[PDB]
Design an enzyme around this catalytic site. Sequence first.
Site, short mmCIF file in Angstrom:
data_model
loop_
_atom_site.label_atom_id
_atom_site.label_comp_id
_atom_site.label_asym_id
_atom_site.label_seq_id
_atom_site.Cartn_x
_atom_site.Cartn_y
_atom_site.Cartn_z
N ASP D 51 0.90 -1.12 0.01
CA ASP D 51 0.15 -0.01 -0.05
C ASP D 51 0.74 1.21 0.06
O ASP D 51 0.95 2.13 0.82
CB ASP D 51 -1.02 0.02 1.10
CG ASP D 51 -2.05 -0.97 1.10
OD1 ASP D 51 -2.85 -0.92 0.27
OD2 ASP D 51 -2.21 -1.85 1.82
N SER D 76 1.97 6.97 -0.13
CA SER D 76 1.01 6.26 0.78
C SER D 76 -0.36 6.10 -0.07
O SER D 76 -1.12 7.13 -0.07
CB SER D 76 0.84 6.82 2.09
OG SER D 76 0.05 6.04 2.90
N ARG D 77 -0.76 4.66 -0.01
CA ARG D 77 -2.27 4.39 -0.59
C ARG D 77 -3.37 4.77 0.31
O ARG D 77 -4.55 4.44 -0.23
CB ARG D 77 -2.04 3.30 -1.26
CG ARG D 77 -1.22 3.02 -2.56
CD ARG D 77 -1.23 1.92 -3.38
NE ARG D 77 0.18 1.33 -3.85
CZ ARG D 77 0.03 1.15 -5.40
NH1 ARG D 77 -1.00 1.01 -5.95
NH2 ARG D 77 1.29 1.03 -5.68
N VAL D 78 -2.93 5.13 1.47
CA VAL D 78 -4.09 5.06 2.47
C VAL D 78 -4.29 7.00 2.76
O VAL D 78 -5.52 7.23 2.58
CB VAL D 78 -3.74 4.69 3.83
CG1 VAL D 78 -4.81 5.15 4.96
CG2 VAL D 78 -3.82 3.31 3.68
#
Lengths: 60, 49, 250, 239, 47, 100, 118, 118
Positions: D51, D76-78
């Site tokens: 992620d 960051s994929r969050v």
Amino acid sequence: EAMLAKTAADNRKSAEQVAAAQADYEKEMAEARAQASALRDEARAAGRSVVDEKRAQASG
Amino acid sequence: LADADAMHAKALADAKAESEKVTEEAKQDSERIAAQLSEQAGSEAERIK
Amino acid sequence: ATLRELRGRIRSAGSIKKITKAQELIATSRIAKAQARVEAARPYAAEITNMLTELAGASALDHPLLVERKQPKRAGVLVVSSDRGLCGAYNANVLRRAEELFSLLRDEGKDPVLYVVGRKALGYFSFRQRTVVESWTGFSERPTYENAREIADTLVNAFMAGADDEGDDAGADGILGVDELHIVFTEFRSMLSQTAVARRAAPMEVEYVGEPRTLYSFEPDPETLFDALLPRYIATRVYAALLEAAASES
Amino acid sequence: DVFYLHSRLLERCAKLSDELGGGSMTGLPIIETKANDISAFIPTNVISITDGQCFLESDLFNQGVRPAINVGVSVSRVGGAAQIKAMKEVAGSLRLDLSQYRELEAFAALDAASKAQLDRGARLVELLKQPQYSPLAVEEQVVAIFLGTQGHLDSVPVEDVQRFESELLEHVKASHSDIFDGIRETKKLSEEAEEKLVSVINEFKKGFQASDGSSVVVAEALDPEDLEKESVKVRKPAP
Amino acid sequence: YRELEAFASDLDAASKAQLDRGARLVELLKQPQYSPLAVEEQVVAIF
Amino acid sequence: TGIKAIDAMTPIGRGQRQLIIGDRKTGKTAVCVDTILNQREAWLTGDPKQQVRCVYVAIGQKGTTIASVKRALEEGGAMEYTTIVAAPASDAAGFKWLAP
Amino acid sequence: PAIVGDEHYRVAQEVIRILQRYKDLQDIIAILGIDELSEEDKQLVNRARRIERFLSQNMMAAEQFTGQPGSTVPLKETIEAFDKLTKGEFDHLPEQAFFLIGGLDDLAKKAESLGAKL
Amino acid sequence: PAIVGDEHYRVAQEVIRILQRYKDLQDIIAILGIDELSEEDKQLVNRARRIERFLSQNMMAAEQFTGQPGSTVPLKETIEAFDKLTKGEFDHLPEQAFFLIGGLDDLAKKAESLGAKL
Ligand SMILES: Nc1ncnc2c1ncn2[C@@H]1O[C@H](COP(=O)(O)OP(=O)(O)OP(=O)(O)O)[C@@H](O)[C@H]1O
Ligand SMILES: [Mg+2]
């Protein structure tokens, strides 16, 4: 003639006096700021030395 | 010229007052920093113990 | 990815090569043009030298620009630099000669007063923290006589103002001046030779030769013509220096 | 099935629903690239699995950028969901802004906007430098990024950005220590907290000393003969 | 034209003419989709 | 993590997988160890909703480097909530493959 | 041209041509500098930078990564705005004004926040 | 810094930074030389050349190959000399003065032998 010469000289004196007044104010403020920074930095160094020696003696 | 002399004197007096204030503030900050750092040093010593 | 980025690098190098070759050829043509303009200005200056010599030999050697200033304290230095940057050592050598002059001037208690032509010298001196009194820009590629006219006028005014300037004070005029006018520029000796040279535009110096058959008539008087002509000679020599600098830059 | 090897391992790091206790496992897999080749096999697989990534570069490390995060390709994929509200507010577009700044710096190797962007980006790059074994609490990081992205570092020299940050954080921890408490408790920077922080920053700036010495408030010679003289010619014998 | 435009404006007269001719010819060889031309029309355009 | 760059630009949440990828000696282990050490405040709170328990898996790593990491964790008091799974370079390929 | 129309196609082709020329010139700009380009090519480089920034947009689904809410730009407004860009109507605006915005109203407001005006 | 001290670490990191900047500039320098660099970059390039020459040394085992005996530089002297280099204190000296020598005494000797002086 002396009155005219005095007028010119005092005009120069007033201009340079204003310049010197502001310059001296700024210089004294800069000196105060430098003294403050020196006090803060020497306090920081003293604290660092205190913590280092305290931890060293505790470890020993 | 009289005004310039008076203004220079006033600037010098104001500078003296401001320098005293700045010195006092820097002092107080120095004691605060020393106190907090001493507290941190004590905490670290307790951690080592 | 190695091959991809390396092929991209090859393409970039090819583009740079093509641009540089084109610039080299255009620079060759511009060298031709600049040299031609250098010959074009030879006769006027060559014969105005004769006119000035006749006036000087038929008049008193007492022009304000001609008389040395006692206790010289400020020497004017004009640095002729380029506007573009793709010249390799042109600006570097010009500025090294300028410093080789500045140190000498400080040696004899002369604080240089800085004037600039072009942009690169501005950046160099901004890095060196040396203030520029006045700067001219945008014509180093091809200088016209007009620009030399303004440059010479400004420098001559700065020189003259120093006559009434006393010590660090400006005296009656109220405008601080200079004691000397110095020029730093690249003398286009030939294709391979391009050396920066410091030149004292002012104060004028006098040479002599014993020899007269006939006496030149003057109108209204020799002194008036000398006065009206000497700044023109200053401007002409500045223009010649600018032409030489353009040729050397190309 | 090397991709499967890594994928089935890394998919076990998860955030469980409240039915399953709500526990979580955060994964920090490490990958060693060779010659900065993120196009190799294992790097590509693991990048496509996780992620986001924090790509560390040796060029940035040697330049003094430590940690050597490559902001352009690190992500960051969050996103903001993994930050407290204050950090979201102060550091909304920081990564995007730094990517744009690096782009501009590369291109502009200029108008007022370009110079302002370059100066802001240099200050922000200095701000994110951090020595090893010197962690910052979330509130301290919030205050630092507030310094950066709110324009309070524009008056300080780039060289002093790190020292200015350290000294301001120390000052706030010494006095005005309720801003950190507010950020800790509420997870957000209140309007009055921001007012107090701005006033404290201004006062400290007045007190701050620049390394050069300013205030951040608001060669051999020509042989004299070689110097060719411009001399008028006179057709007379010398007197 | 390709060589002398990769080069490229203050050119020899013949070179300026070559640049102009080459730009015109490049524009000439362009063609929209689904628009084939009879051989005679191509001859006239190239002429 | 306690690192301004990571926490501000590439924030890491709980349950996320963030990849530390880079060449040799770029600071990857430094970042991970600093992240582990930064959880001591949460551990000391005593609230399991705040506490983060750490696992370090050293795969093919020289044993002396594993010892150095363990020391860095000890000094910061991170071993109290950390477990190290070690598959040093001397371990057979089975342990290296199985450690994660 | 048959499907999208003559104007849409022309604007798209002009944008593609400008971006292609900019990509061609990028290496030279990187090594030598933008001051060595022809005045036409400098103008084209500025237009291309503005265009490539304008092609970016604030997406709805990207809110969680930027906080800024997304935007929707109708096709007609898109075509008109890019036609204006290719003609250099917005050259006087800073390039940063074209970064992550929607239509021309967003461009005007952002340029206003940067001092410039539409 | 925890092992080698603050001064040694600072000097080493500054040297590494200068050399890295030189490596970065290699791309421009390979084509255009130092001329097109900014004054900061020109100064740093000269400094980096001097530093990379001064990292060379006349080894003890190299005497077999060149006759010149080796030299030993104490660590403190190395730190001091490279701190002086990174500060630009030896910019005047020629590059070859720093090639295959020991400490600062050797630097002064070779600078004298090359017509310069420390
Ligand atoms: N923020 C930092 N500031 C200064 N030095 C740092 C920083 N982070 C790491 N270092 C140093 O950089 C060097 C590399 O660190 P580290 O061993 O963690 O990197 P790595 O990429 O995991 O290395 P390896 O390839 O050996 O596994 C070490 O000296 C470490 O102390
Ligand atoms: Mg490691």
